[PDB]
Hints:
Bound molecules: magnesium ion
Structural class of chain B: mainly alpha
Number of helices of chain B: 1
Distance between the termini of chain B: 91 Å
Largest sheet of chain A: 4 strands, antiparallel
CATH architecture of chain A: Sandwich
CATH superfamily of chain A: C2 domain
Shape of chain A: flat
Order of helices and strands of chain B: H
Number of domains of chain A: 1
Number of helices of chain A: 1
Number of strands of chain A: 8
CATH topology of chain B: Single alpha-helices involved in coiled-coils or other helix-helix interfaces
Oligomer: part of a larger assembly
Shape of chain B: rod-shaped
Amino acid sequence: KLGKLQYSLDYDFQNNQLLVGIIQAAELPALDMGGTSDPYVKVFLLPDKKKKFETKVHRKTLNPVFNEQFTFKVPYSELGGKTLVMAVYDFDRFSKHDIIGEFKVPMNTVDFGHVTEEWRDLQSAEKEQEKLGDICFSLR
Amino acid sequence: MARENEMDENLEQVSGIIGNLRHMALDMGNEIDTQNRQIDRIMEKADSNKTRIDEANQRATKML
Ligand SMILES: [Mg+2]
């Protein structure tokens, strides 16, 4: 309900690197005072959360246009089992930056060869039990 | 990228050689033109002397 996100995806086989472009976003819900939020998008490889990339902060727009580009130096063999995460955050100067949305893209569903660029609907990020342990015994 | 660069070097060399080929083609064509003009001159003179020698031969055999 927050809005949609237009992004670009393609792989450069000449340098063996992933080219992820953040085009823009639309119809984002407002969380700030003026009637518009201050959005910025954090993008990182889904498999390992290392070297996350963040875009510049846009002031008071529910339709931010970033038109930015990020490069993930990852071989083509490892790429297949690697996912992409694009999460939209709301900037706040005096508090925690609340997450507006998130989107995950499996690299086995992605087809490289033609330059991909699409709009995808944003969804609410996941917050389960912490322990995840089990004990087995018998009663008689 | 080594594959790509190697190829890049190749294309650069091909570029240079192509430029030299251009220069050579220009010199070639120009000299061909000038030589064609010279050949025209040669045929003019040769026809002139052909007429000269035909008339002269006729006049020479006339007094025989
Ligand atoms: Mg704010």
